[PDB]
């Protein structure tokens, strides 16, 4: 198996090939989807649903959360939301490797209570072609 701490998401500080992990990041989830575009004819094998595969639109979504630590990289995610950009984000899988895809920054939400930490969640969605450098 692989460690959960080694599965990170990270930003573009300068915007051109400069990657730093964000902050207090208690949880990450790169999450893939496919739109399962159905093609079932009048005859299909006895009544089973037949699917095509490669014609479906496919995507990815990143849901990060953790404690509010003001870094050079936490303020960078603010500037993506107010000035709408699609920078090259990067989610590293412990042993798979770098994904290196353009995501938008769909939902950011800073939260805080009278007795606890300052936290933030951080939702994303895909915006282009992903990769896999292995």
């Amino acid at each position: 198996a692989q460690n959960g701490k080694d599965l990170l998401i990270k930003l573009d500080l300068t915007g051109s090939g400069q990657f730093e992990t964000i902050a207090g990041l208690r949880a990450t989830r790169i999450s893939f989807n496919a739109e399962t575009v159905d093609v079932t004819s009048l005859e299909s094998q006895g009544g089973w649903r037949e699917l095509l595969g490669g014609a479906g639109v496919r995507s990815a979504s990143i849901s990060g959360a953790g404690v509010f630590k003001d870094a050079d990289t936490d303020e960078r995610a603010r500037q993506i939301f107010f000035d709408g950009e699609v920078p090259e984000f990067q989610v590293i899988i412990p042993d798979f490797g770098i994904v290196q895809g353009p995501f938008m920054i769909t939902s950011i939400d800073y939260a805080g209570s009278h007795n606890g930490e300052a936290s933030y969640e951080l939702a994303m969605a895909s915006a282009g072609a992903l990769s896999f450098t292995a």
């Binding site: 902050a23 990041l25 208690r26 404690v67 930490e117």
Partner: protein
């Protein structure tokens, strides 16, 4: 403990005995190690911590639910409740400085207040939460 708690007790001890009230109620009798002698009888005591590890990908922090007890040999224990009124306002909203790492907040929690041994001593515990950062 984690790396901070060596300096957290040294900071919440030094925030005590510089508070102006409880230098007039308890006196110099603020100690973890009780010094040998005749046992003054209205002392406070700052040892029984416990940690909870509020950490992240980048670095580590902790949650210290340290206990500060107030002991009195008085007949009633409006003496101890007046002494822990002087404990708690000295610590909630701390703005302490540590020797290793930072703390971000010092809140308040449960404070049991009962009769301990032979219905003679009156001890009132005070659990304070200290979310720190290593």
């Amino acid at each position: 403990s984690y790396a901070v708690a060596g300096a957290l007790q040294a900071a919440v001890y030094q925030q005590l005995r510089a508070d102006a009230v409880l230098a007039a109620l308890v006196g110099t009798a603020v100690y973890d190690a009780v010094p040998p002698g005749p046992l003054a009888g209205t002392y406070v005591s700052l040892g029984p911590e416990d940690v909870a590890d509020a950490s992240d990908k980048t670095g580590a922090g902790a949650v210290h639910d340290f206990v500060i007890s107030v002991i009195t040999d008085a007949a009633g224990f409006a003496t101890a409740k007046a002494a822990a009124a002087a404990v708690s306002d000295a610590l909630v909203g701390a703005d302490l400085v540590l020797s290793r790492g930072r703390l971000v907040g010092l809140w308040f929690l449960r404070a049991k207040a009962r009769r301990v041994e032979k219905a003679d001593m009156r001890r009132i515990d005070l659990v304070f939460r200290a979310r720190v950062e290593g």
